[PDB]
Design a protein around this ligand. Sequence first.
Ligand SMILES: OC[C@H]1O[C@@H]2O[C@H]3[C@H](O)[C@@H](O)[C@@H](O[C@H]4[C@H](O)[C@@H](O)[C@@H](O[C@H]5[C@H](O)[C@@H](O)[C@@H](O[C@H]6[C@H](O)[C@@H](O)[C@@H](O[C@H]7[C@H](O)[C@@H](O)[C@@H](O[C@H]8[C@H](O)[C@@H](O)[C@@H](O[C@H]1[C@H](O)[C@H]2O)O[C@@H]8CO)O[C@@H]7CO)O[C@@H]6CO)O[C@@H]5CO)O[C@@H]4CO)O[C@@H]3CO
Ligand SMILES: OC[C@H]1O[C@@H]2O[C@H]3[C@H](O)[C@@H](O)[C@@H](O[C@H]4[C@H](O)[C@@H](O)[C@@H](O[C@H]5[C@H](O)[C@@H](O)[C@@H](O[C@H]6[C@H](O)[C@@H](O)[C@@H](O[C@H]7[C@H](O)[C@@H](O)[C@@H](O[C@H]8[C@H](O)[C@@H](O)[C@@H](O[C@H]1[C@H](O)[C@H]2O)O[C@@H]8CO)O[C@@H]7CO)O[C@@H]6CO)O[C@@H]5CO)O[C@@H]4CO)O[C@@H]3CO
Lengths: 588, 588
Amino acid sequence: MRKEAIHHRSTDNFAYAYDSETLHLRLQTKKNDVDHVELLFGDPYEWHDGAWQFQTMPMRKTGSDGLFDYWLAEVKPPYRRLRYGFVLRAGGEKLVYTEKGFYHEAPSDDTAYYFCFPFLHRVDLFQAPDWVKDTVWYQIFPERFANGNPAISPKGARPWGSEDPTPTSFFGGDLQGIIDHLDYLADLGITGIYLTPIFRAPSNHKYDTADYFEIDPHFGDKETLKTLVKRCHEKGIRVMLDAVFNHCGYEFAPFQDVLKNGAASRYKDWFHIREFPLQTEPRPNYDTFAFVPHMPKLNTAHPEVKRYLLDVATYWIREFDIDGWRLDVANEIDHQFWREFRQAVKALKPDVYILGLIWHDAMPWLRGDQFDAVMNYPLADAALRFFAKEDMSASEFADRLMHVLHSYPKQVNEAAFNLLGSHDTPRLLTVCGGDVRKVKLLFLFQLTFTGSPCIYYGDEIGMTGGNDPECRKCMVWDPEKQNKELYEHVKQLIALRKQYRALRRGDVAFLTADDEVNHLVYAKTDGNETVMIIINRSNEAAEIPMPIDARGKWLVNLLTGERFAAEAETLCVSLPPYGFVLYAVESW
Amino acid sequence: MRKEAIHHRSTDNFAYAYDSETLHLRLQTKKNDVDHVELLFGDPYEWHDGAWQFQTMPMRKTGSDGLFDYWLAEVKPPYRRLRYGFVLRAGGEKLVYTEKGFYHEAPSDDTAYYFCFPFLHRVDLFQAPDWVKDTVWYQIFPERFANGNPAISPKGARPWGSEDPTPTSFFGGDLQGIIDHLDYLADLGITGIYLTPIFRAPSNHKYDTADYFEIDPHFGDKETLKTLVKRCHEKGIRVMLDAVFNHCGYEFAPFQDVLKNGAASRYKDWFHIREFPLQTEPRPNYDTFAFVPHMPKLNTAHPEVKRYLLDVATYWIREFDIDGWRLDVANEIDHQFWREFRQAVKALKPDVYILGLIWHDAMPWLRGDQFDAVMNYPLADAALRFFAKEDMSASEFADRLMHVLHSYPKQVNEAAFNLLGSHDTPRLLTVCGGDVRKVKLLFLFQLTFTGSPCIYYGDEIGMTGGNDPECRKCMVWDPEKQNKELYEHVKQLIALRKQYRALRRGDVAFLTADDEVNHLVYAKTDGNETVMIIINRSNEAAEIPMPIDARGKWLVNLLTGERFAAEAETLCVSLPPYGFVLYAVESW
Ligand SMILES: OC[C@H]1O[C@@H]2O[C@H]3[C@H](O)[C@@H](O)[C@@H](O[C@H]4[C@H](O)[C@@H](O)[C@@H](O[C@H]5[C@H](O)[C@@H](O)[C@@H](O[C@H]6[C@H](O)[C@@H](O)[C@@H](O[C@H]7[C@H](O)[C@@H](O)[C@@H](O[C@H]8[C@H](O)[C@@H](O)[C@@H](O[C@H]1[C@H](O)[C@H]2O)O[C@@H]8CO)O[C@@H]7CO)O[C@@H]6CO)O[C@@H]5CO)O[C@@H]4CO)O[C@@H]3CO
Ligand SMILES: OC[C@H]1O[C@@H]2O[C@H]3[C@H](O)[C@@H](O)[C@@H](O[C@H]4[C@H](O)[C@@H](O)[C@@H](O[C@H]5[C@H](O)[C@@H](O)[C@@H](O[C@H]6[C@H](O)[C@@H](O)[C@@H](O[C@H]7[C@H](O)[C@@H](O)[C@@H](O[C@H]8[C@H](O)[C@@H](O)[C@@H](O[C@H]1[C@H](O)[C@H]2O)O[C@@H]8CO)O[C@@H]7CO)O[C@@H]6CO)O[C@@H]5CO)O[C@@H]4CO)O[C@@H]3CO
């Protein structure tokens, strides 16, 4: 029984509080290295006969990547506090893993041997807005969406052409447009929209922001905005704006003032500047986004900058009653700042969803003191890799997913922002090579996977385009020109997720086979509710055997409707090329 | 090459900023499973040819416990950002470890694959006061040290037998006393006293706290303290106090109130009470320390308490200028409180040492937003295990030591509070079975290890006594009944640590052999200063071999002065049973 692979710490994804009463303890072991494993536990002060009184329940296997197996244990400390150790019987061997080491028998003279989860506090608890767990997001890069009132800038008219429209010049979008095609959304079934930056700024993309307190005229005015939110909410649609706090635009008052005066400027400390005769020759002598001079890094550490932002952050939550902030390049800001940020925001509107943009691992932020969630990129990479480019197998895929899933605490996932693409990556279609078939499978997986899914304005009606700035083509409002089949597909799937909690709140369970390198089958569960998903990611007709739960009564096809009685041990499911099917199991 | 054992995550002890411009990256791998390992790094936005421009430097093995070896990479990231990966070689096998997985060749099409340490913000940087690293702590339990002005309570005056007195009832210790024996301390060499709780409370010990704003009379008064404090500083001695916040006393005003009113009392929320007919029958129906009725837990979540306690914390820092708070049962309070706590305090007096009392793994609190350090109880467990009880071998010791050490970020250990005993643990001497020899070995080890050591009043003159309240015998001031040899021993060892930088803030390195069970040989290094310690943990004269570095010119005995030319491969050192020797290796 290899020990180099047995691991647990009482922190982050291994030990945490799920709710204000239940603790979650995850243990890591090698793949099939250990048969069973029990959670040995008890309240830290429950002593008797000079020996620590303790009881022991058993942990279940909740999945495994390509190396480890993961064990979960759900427990409620009688007296809000607990000490704990692990007991793993693998074959004839029997170990007891403790913070102090491995012992052939459970020490009982002292608690010191065991890991400890002090007090389960409700305040330290991690709780993200319960609603995002049920919404379906739709991102709409304002500029290229719909032209309502022509309070637009002077240049190019809708659809430059069939291919390649878009260099780095405007088409004239605007908030009004969104308000107008607001019926479209409500029909597609979405419940939340996320607008990319919209504050007074020089580009078609509002990231090189100029004034955070003013909405870009080319988009609208306070009136226009509060109306968009009114209509939205009115229909049950939430709104999340884009918070660009890591850096500011070149036209930002204070930064401009820094050149007007140099070392003199009353705003030097608002940025990070080394050399003062600001020269951008080889490259900026001050910290800028990547190396983009026209985008200097703010100084979230400075006292003022902090209050400038903090006010902004709250300004819109109070002035327009928005529903959340997409924090841009969030990972490049001091956690302290985010701590104050969350406090300011959450003190005004608890329900404000605080989504951050972090590409890599985000444990450091999702401790419950900073972000509500983060863009689940590691997931996207996988989905595309599997369905689009067909690089990894179904198991490799299943593995990569199990792995990420287990690197955060349970609830951290339930609020994750799962997207497949955005305004920075190649349109979902083109990445599939125009094989809509694939695109539908991507939507399926994503719309039938717990988290908080988001759709990029063009993808549902089959919009094609390469990388930036191609993914940003003007939304197609020509009935004839948009793929209604893809649209109906997403529509029904969205409404499907809408009435099958399992699909949006349950846990995944891959019944993977290291043999069916192209057959992927997983099931979502929530109490009684169980939905089975089968996918033949093959270019040939396949026959995939599906495990029918013994306890099943009925078996319904969420697509076809046909509802037949389950009966055999298994159900060989026949599917066409790149085909799929959703089955809802029963109980009686 | 076992992958189940390799591990790293960008966070905690694995990836942290050491200082303003330095990052430490640790890699975990199986013991001896890997020959070499190179840190593959580079800036996130550094590009050319569409290929990410990254470079490589090699990591050094910083030691290993029982199951893993450990690697450290000290990198100075320019522009402060970094995306990085590891490259571990072996018997021809060459693997590339990235957050995204294992590859036989470092990917270069996109940084997404690599681990990431975003920005190296200064404000999030962990910085515990600096002096604590350069001090040795003497801890005194007020009620049993020295008796000055007898404003003492009415009870037994001084001892009876050599170990008889002490049941759970007074003797007359008081602050004046501490003052009247400074010379003793000043002479011993200690430079910081940490004294048990001294606030109005009806108990020989003062955790039963009844008023956090008044010095229990029996010890003295406001004026007395200002003196102790005024004088200590004068002598170069710092003062730390015991903050008892996890719970209050039974005679605590606010709790008293709640006793006669219950559902009424303005203070109903100040604590934790389920059923309101407040009863201490089979056991409290309200949250209390362990199950100690007269010690109810506080609500550090409640707005008033928080303001109350935060003021207490600040009070004794303004009015008496103390240098450090000892936070008792700290692990049972919600981190948020410890964050506000740290701010209030540090804001008033940066040098305030905020030491928490956490037994188990204290990572969650050592992120830099809460405690400055914690009681190194894991290392105390090892020491005793090895020297006194003599269970584990020199290897098992050297391992546990490497394990606890590698589980925190370097600068966290530097400020760790290294104690060997308290008023809760049995006296070394008795734990050594009365073998003063072992004892001196403990002191030797303790005063040779990096951290901030703390001697327990009495242990220097070799007092005796087992568990509570044995370890609380009145202090022996009779020159006749106090081991002058031990005192004089600890004294020159302290004076040694004070003059050999390596001994106090350097790195440890065990050269112990696996077949060795009684010979402990280790070196403390810091720059060109190198101190070698040889310990014969055997009741029998021994000959231990000690390697000498090539460059070594001299080799000086620290407690003999004897100095001799290096010139040799090894130096067989002969020691008497339970012997020890400190060598300073001068080298041109
Ligand atoms: O304010 C409370 C307390 O806080 C501090 O104590 C901390 C200490 O600094 C840490 O080192 C640590 O201790 C852990 C301990 O070392 C472990 O061994 C384990 O302890 C278990 C015991 O081994 C086990 O035997 C049993 O304990 C039973 C006792 O044996 C039994 O006698 C009785 O307990 C009575 C005490 O013995 C008695 O002294 C008295 O306690 C009061 C103290 O005398 C007084 O100084 C003060 O305590 C401080 C302490 O000084 C700080 O250093 O308040 C005490 C409260 O009255 O009365 C007790 C009456 O019940 O019953 C116990 C079973 O309940 O069980 C323990 C289980 O914990 O784990 C320890 C936890 O880490 O942590 C402590 C804070 O917990
Ligand atoms: O003004 C600059 C920029 O502003 C806007 O950009 C913002 C963007 O819209 C936001 O979404 C966010 O960006 C975050 C993004 O959401 C995350 O997904 C992520 O990005 C990672 C990349 O996805 C990943 O591929 C890798 O990227 C590396 C590339 O692979 C590598 O080829 C190279 O990049 C070069 C580009 O390929 C090249 O085209 C060129 O890029 C320029 C754009 O074409 C140009 O339009 C403009 O960008 C605007 C953008 O359009 C606005 O919407 O300037 C770009 C720079 O010249 O040059 C690149 C070399 O610099 O290098 C990258 C890595 O350096 O890793 C990344 C990081 O994980 O994180 C994004 C935040 O980092 O914020 C931006 C900025 O506000």
